[PDB]
Write an enzyme that holds these catalytic residues in place. Structure first.
Site, short mmCIF file in Angstrom:
data_model
loop_
_atom_site.label_atom_id
_atom_site.label_comp_id
_atom_site.label_asym_id
_atom_site.label_seq_id
_atom_site.Cartn_x
_atom_site.Cartn_y
_atom_site.Cartn_z
N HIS A 8 -0.97 7.49 -13.61
CA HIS A 8 -0.57 7.04 -12.30
C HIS A 8 -0.77 8.11 -11.29
O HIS A 8 -1.38 7.88 -10.25
CB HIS A 8 0.92 6.65 -12.25
CG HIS A 8 1.42 6.42 -10.85
ND1 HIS A 8 1.90 7.42 -10.03
CD2 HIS A 8 1.52 5.27 -10.12
CE1 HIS A 8 2.26 6.83 -8.86
NE2 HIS A 8 2.05 5.53 -8.87
N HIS A 67 -3.43 8.76 -7.72
CA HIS A 67 -3.18 9.09 -6.34
C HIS A 67 -4.04 10.25 -5.95
O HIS A 67 -4.64 10.25 -4.88
CB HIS A 67 -1.72 9.45 -6.06
CG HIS A 67 -0.81 8.25 -6.01
ND1 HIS A 67 -0.43 7.62 -4.85
CD2 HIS A 67 -0.21 7.56 -7.02
CE1 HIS A 67 0.38 6.59 -5.21
NE2 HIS A 67 0.54 6.52 -6.51
N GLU A 110 3.69 7.37 -15.72
CA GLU A 110 3.78 7.95 -14.41
C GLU A 110 2.90 9.16 -14.24
O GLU A 110 2.07 9.16 -13.33
CB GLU A 110 5.22 8.36 -14.03
CG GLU A 110 5.34 8.84 -12.58
CD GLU A 110 6.80 9.17 -12.30
OE1 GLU A 110 7.63 8.94 -13.22
OE2 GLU A 110 7.09 9.65 -11.18
N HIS A 139 11.34 8.76 -4.65
CA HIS A 139 10.76 9.74 -5.52
C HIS A 139 11.69 10.91 -5.62
O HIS A 139 11.72 11.59 -6.65
CB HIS A 139 9.39 10.25 -5.05
CG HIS A 139 8.29 9.25 -5.30
ND1 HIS A 139 7.59 9.19 -6.49
CD2 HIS A 139 7.78 8.27 -4.51
CE1 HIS A 139 6.69 8.18 -6.36
NE2 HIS A 139 6.77 7.60 -5.17
N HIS A 171 8.07 0.02 -8.12
CA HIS A 171 6.70 -0.10 -7.69
C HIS A 171 6.27 -1.53 -7.78
O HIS A 171 5.49 -2.00 -6.96
CB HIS A 171 5.75 0.80 -8.48
CG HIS A 171 5.97 2.25 -8.14
ND1 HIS A 171 6.98 3.02 -8.66
CD2 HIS A 171 5.29 3.05 -7.28
CE1 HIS A 171 6.87 4.25 -8.09
NE2 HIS A 171 5.86 4.32 -7.25
N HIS A 227 10.14 5.14 0.30
CA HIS A 227 9.30 5.56 -0.79
C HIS A 227 9.47 7.04 -0.98
O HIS A 227 9.51 7.52 -2.11
CB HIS A 227 7.82 5.24 -0.52
CG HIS A 227 6.93 5.46 -1.71
ND1 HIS A 227 5.92 6.39 -1.77
CD2 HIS A 227 6.92 4.83 -2.92
CE1 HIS A 227 5.36 6.29 -2.99
NE2 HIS A 227 5.93 5.36 -3.73
#
Lengths: 626, 313, 626
Positions: C321, C325, C306, C174, C201, C170
């Site tokens: 998104h 987080h 995103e 990115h 994802h 992951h």
């Protein structure tokens, strides 16, 4: 049901140790064993010694004789109590393997039954100690790996010699083909047992040699001279049964006579056996001569050499191989003065661990080799399968043509073997060699009009010598190890045959644990062959080196029609492991001499010259991961 | 009281092995032992070897040094956890014997502390086995006598050689007169220890010879020649503390150099000693000569031969 | 040489925590450096937060707009002194991955660089403690597995969530597709990054769901309502660099406004996005409308959601998104009055461990799904490849059609990441899920006269629901996980295509350790993705259960000529892992929508009904071994 039957068998196996003490109000109550069981536990049971074998045979016969399975259990209940435990396990396992009534049934794990033979005394002590130290249901785990000042380079080989799977296999093999086996009594005969005896042991040596070379060590040398002193080995194994352990053998011992046999009597036997080889005939008891036929010769020799009950002359030719184990085993106390237990050589489960094993077996292998030498070499005619051409072979792995080998940790459950007490389980952690899975792709051109049937034979041999790179096929013969043998059908035109390593005919796919067995599965339900025998899977290829040692990969295709025998035998049974084990109650499925094409002398300069069109060599690398 | 003091020391020594697990997160913590910290726990302790003796001496000194009895117990308690157990028993016993706080403190009987040394492995594991076999408060009794083919006549002597009391005595004697004994440190000296060393061992041999004759056997012959092969002996002793046992020896192999010492050196030391006896003087470190006086001679020789710390050279 | 270059890079990566202490008299000299250095060293870096990303981007650019590889190393060396370390690792890795000069070069292991993120605080503490406890060269080994009473069933999933490989992947992904990525500056553009964002994802969620079902748990539900309180999770991770650790979250917390963003503008953004899917167009900054074309639509949506720099309107559409987080990460201290560190959600390396991750990602996945819903379904025409028929598929393993999964122990070397001191190595032992190797054999009939080229697509989907056995293809779409995609050529007549699991396009074949990299191997030399990215191999299939859970095995063949794009790109480079990663500096190699055929709605009640002739379903079992 079968499952119930399995359950009954497992308890025959539990606490072999503790089920001594007569527990019999009138101790005549198993008169059949007043005679047998003249071994009380004092010394250990010897797989090799004749007297011990005789008792064992007597026991098996009773088990075979048992009218029904229930009767079988009853004998095995009441009788176990008197006879020496080791003998008992031996006799029962043989019975389970052969006796029809036992169409149900695995034998409990040897490693699991006698954990002490598989793991070192220290680990065993620790587990026992932890059990006592703090009472608690909680599980105990002990890592057997230790920490130690390794002086001897022989230690490097320990992964091979000490391997649990290897030892277990050796135990099982002797069970399937007992030396004591009397075909008249059973009625059935073990096909080519003498030859198999030769082949299996030869393979163990050959495989061993590949390890040494992988290690960078030279090939093992035979125990040709009896005078020479032996290298020492200390097993560090304890026997849980009583106070003792396998006696270690310090460095440098010349050879001592035992009461049972003089080492000179031995030397005679070697001369005799080898005489008859040259003279091309052996003398039977009847004083008739039987020829060492090409077909029969290895088998007859195997029986004499081991020697089995089958030997044409036991009295004259003796039992060289077995005595060798006995003599080496009690080198420490030949006289029996000090009253010390024998070394690892005495037991089929332990013997592989001692490096001496190889020296002796190479010696015996040599005997067979001399016989092979007398035979003429193979013509193109014998080797070739016309119309079939092998285009190429490739091995697929993470990296093509490279196999990776590493060490894997594993755990063994002690609980079935030693008194657990409160603990649910005591497991010992050990490490063993293992390799990545791989497949082979063989491209074959079938020139013929019709579909053909071929037996694919695959062997692996080291490229490098101790000196430099030299593919001298004569020498290679000793080294070549059998990877796989299988039947495939080829259509006309190009064909690609893919086989996975997992499928290997040499190895045992899986050995079920006690836990597995209590459950009730179906590989089928077979016997001591069941999960036990077969070479261990992790062991399939040699370790190699970090550098990636080069090995020759040899693939040969032969005409199956020629290779197979016709006859009418069973359902799909223990045949996974045919290469070393054979098939249950069946004739050996391959007509060719075991080890073919490698068994006879090769004139060629390089291996390559030897190749016919239906043969191929691909060089691959084996690289170990630290 | 002194007897209450007993009752603490005895469970200090009770089950040595399991009182290991050092359990002190930093090695540096016991600077008190920064000089030593060489021989691990499980290893066998040698009464004879110099390096082992040195560690042992270091331990005793600490025990002697202990200001008071309470302090003595404390260091002992904690030291036992880290040092090899055999060394520990050795050091403590010496301390108990000499250190003034300890009169009327007997030690735990050696046989009782280490039963495995006194009795055969078969009656060790049988007894251990019975304990596990059926759990019950009930007592277990095992007869060590066995049954076996008695091939070697040496076996006849076993009553003497194997005797529990004899072995125990030998252990104790070395404790009263340690080879390591340094009179300066203790301050007190062991009178005629060298001579006693000679006398005690001589008596053991003499007594042994009487047994052989009683047996109808000839007197034992000295191991004069280093070259000759030794007769084998298998002790059948286990060390429960670990899996390990005393290694047995079969007969028939001449003598091998150890890393620590070579046989040739042994021979040298003998010719050296014989010469001195001969010219009637020995050479000190100072390179002065001391006479082998009638009064002193045995003692001086004893120290050199054993040899003790007392050896003049 | 390249090797030397590798060596230089590894030290950029060493002792990052320590590297602080600027030791710079003046930044003014570093004009290039002026832009970065806002975020303080010790502070945690958020992958996600826009401002942090901006600084990071500024840093990378300086490293990029260094003149040769000497210049790159120099600025990096200097920049690393001032800038926050996390940002630094992020910027450098991006640079190494893209910058040509770095045609040489792996990045040091993320797990290895920051061992503290991968392993629990206890183990890390122990190793550090052991190092101090007794100074000695000797190696330290610590087993991370622990002992604890586990009340929470979520714990069962830990093998998946906590897996080291998954977290590492992951992180790497990115890096390959940074949100900050500005195509103008670099000049090059990342093909279909928005769509890939969606696909990767989605797969993580899909794979996660398969784990829950294997577990016997129901599928994860989305974070549809923001009002709802979150489930708690405590990571037990420490940051050695400081005293600080990731703050744990106890359950029963609803989402709070942060100074940076009000949860409501988040709600608006989501509504704005959904509204503009429905309207089939999005509004650009120019206030022009761009259609959500079938071809383009997912990509455009991905950038907006995103959101990336690429978003057609950042100002209006926001960054849903990423903010999710951030908001979840600082739930504990939205105000930041507490001055507590953020949770695992803040970092790409850690975020997968928290169960909340799935809830949020399913929520976002839903957004994409609504868009997909607007698209029409696939006709037979689109799916079918005429003339090709799939006869059957078989999976070969120890037991055919059964895959076995077990837990394997592994060790991680801490030494590169944390101060080793005297010790040679400190390794932490952890356990992870793993499966036996297997192969697929697909029989295909090529009716056509000529050889065809096909793309084989293989997916796995759970057979069982939470209710009872129901292969409802609509639902299955969420669950299906991609096993493999590869090109094969079929001749006329029957063909058998064999592929090994090892070859899987989804997984990373191997990640080289800083130690291996210390020498110099030849997989080739590309960058952050090198060994790093790709899904981890052990992870390829779900755990299954001891019983042997049933999964549908789906194989489909499509016309390759259609599927491939033409163009002129590189040598054999990082393409092993194409399915999830894409290809280096190349266009995504498959024309079909990612996830095809599964991406669009399926009309049929049962999956079987869906099948065309070039599709096939084989039911296999996955059985876990305890």
């Amino acid at each position: 049901t079968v499952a119930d039957k399995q359950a009954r068998l497992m308890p025959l196996f539990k606490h072999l140790t503790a089920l001594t003490r007569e527990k019999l109000p009138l101790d005549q109550r198993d008169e059949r064993l007043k005679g047998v069981g003249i071994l009380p536990r004092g010394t250990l049971f010897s797989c090799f010694h004749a007297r011990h074998l005789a008792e064992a045979t007597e026991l098996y016969v009773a088990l075979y004789g048992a009218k029904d399975f229930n009767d079988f259990i009853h004998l095995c209940e009441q009788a176990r109590q008197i006879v020496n435990e080791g003998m008992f396990v031996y006799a029962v396992s043989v019975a389970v393997l052969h006796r029809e009534d036992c169409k149900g049934i695995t034998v409990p794990p040897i490693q699991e039954v006698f954990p002490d033979r598989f793991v070192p005394a220290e680990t065993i002590n620790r587990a026992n100690k932890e059990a006592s130290n703090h009472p608690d249901q909680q599980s105990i785990v002990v890592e057997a790996e230790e920490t130690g000042n390794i002086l001897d380079p022989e230690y490097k080989l320990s992964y091979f010699r000490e391997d649990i799977g290897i030892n277990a296999h050796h135990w099982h093999w002797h069970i399937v083909y007992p030396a004591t086996w009397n075909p008249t009594v059973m009625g059935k005969e073990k096909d080519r047992k003498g030859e198999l005896f030769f082949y299996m042991h030869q393979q163990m040596c050959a495989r061993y040699d590949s390890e040494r070379l992988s290690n960078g060590l030279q090939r093992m040398i035979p125990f040709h001279n009896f005078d020479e002193p032996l290298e020492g080995y200390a097993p560090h194994l304890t026997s849980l049964v009583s106070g003792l352990q396998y006696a270690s053998r310090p460095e440098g011992y010349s050879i001592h006579d035992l009461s049972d046999v003089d080492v000179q009597d031995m030397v005679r036997w070697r001369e005799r056996i080898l005489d008859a080889i040259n003279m091309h005939y052996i003398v039977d008891k009847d004083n008739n001569k039987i020829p060492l036929d090409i077909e029969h010769g290895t088998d007859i020799l195997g029986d004499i050499i081991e020697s089995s009950d089958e030997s044409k002359n036991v009295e004259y030719y003796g039992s060289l191989h077995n005595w060798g184990h006995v003599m080496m085993a009690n080198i420490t106390d030949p006289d029996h003065r000090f009253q010390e237990n024998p070394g690892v050589m005495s037991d089929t489960s332990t013997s592989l661990r001692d490096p001496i094993f190889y020296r002796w077996h190479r010696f015996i292998d040599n005997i067979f080799q001399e016989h092979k030498k007398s035979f003429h070499p193979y013509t193109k005619e014998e080797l070739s399968f016309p119309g079939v051409e092998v285009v190429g072979v490739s091995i697929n792995s993470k990296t093509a043509n490279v196999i990776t080998t590493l060490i894997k940790e594993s755990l063994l459950e002690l609980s079935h073997g030693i008194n657990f007490g409160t603990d649910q389980s005591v497991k010992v952690k050990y490490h063993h060699l293992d390799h990545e899975p791989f497949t082979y792709n063989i491209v074959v051109e079938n020139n013929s009009g019709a579909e053909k049937h071929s037996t694919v034979r695959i062997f692996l041999a080291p490229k490098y010598d101790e000196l430099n790179n030299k593919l001298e096929p004569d020498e290679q013969r000793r080294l070549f190890i059998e990877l796989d043998k299988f039947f495939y059908t080829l259509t006309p035109g190009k064909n690609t045959i893919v086989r996975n390593h997992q499928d290997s005919s040499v190895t045992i796919s899986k050995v079920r644990t006690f836990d597995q067995l209590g459950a009730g599965e179906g590989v089928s339900e077979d016997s001591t062959e069941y999960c036990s025998c077969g070479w261990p899977e992790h062991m399939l290829i040699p370790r190699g080196s970090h550098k990636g040692m080069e090995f020759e990969l040899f693939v040969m295709l032969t005409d199956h029609d020629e290779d197979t025998v016709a006859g009418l035998s069973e359902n799909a049974v223990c045949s996974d492991a045919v290469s070393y084990c054979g098939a249950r109650d069946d004739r050996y499925p391959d007509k060719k001499a075991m080890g073919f094409p490698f068994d006879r002398k090769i004139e060629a300069r390089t291996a390559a010259e030897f190749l016919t069109p239906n043969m191929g060599l691909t060089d691959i690398k084996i690289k170990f991961h630290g």
